[PDB]
């Protein structure tokens, strides 16, 4: 594994997010707001080689999108709705992977609170895992044409980033 620690990039973080001092936690500062306004942030590293693994703790969030993007994705447009963004997304009961405004359903075990992100840049893959259940969720087969940056987007609650990780045994 090539995995290195990274944190959120303050220049790429939505101004309405509360960020921890280590740059690893982001939080939005029975009727709910359905407004599609997302709160996105990008990591402070770009990758164009090697094999990288990180995890995200989603806790109680019910609406989030986690993945990678080229620099060409516009700021705060990291939810798979352009050709520069690849995400795993939850919205309440719906789990998808999304890229270029095209989705595929993902069947996810109940009560997902942690996501694993495996970027095998050299072998043209981005894979999502359920680490609690030690299992594969989805692989994009993609030959990246620019460097990629981790991205993290919420509509509610908070995320925590676990970076610099040894590939768990289920890789």
Author numbering: 531 to 559, 569 to 710
Quoted from the paper:
The tripartite motif (TRIM) proteins form one of the largest subfamilies of RING-type E3 ubiquitin ligases, comprising more than 80 members. About two-thirds of human TRIM proteins feature a PRYSPRY domain, also known as the B30.2 domain, in their C-terminal region. All characterized family members shared the same overall PRYSPRY twisted β-sandwich fold consisting of a 7-stranded and a 6-stranded antiparallel β-sheet.
A characteristic feature of the putative substrate-binding site in the closely related homologs MID1 and MID2 is an arginine located at the C-terminus of β-strand 7 (R587 in MID1 and R637 in MID2) that projects its guanidinium group toward the center of the cavity and two neighboring tryptophan residues lining the pocket.
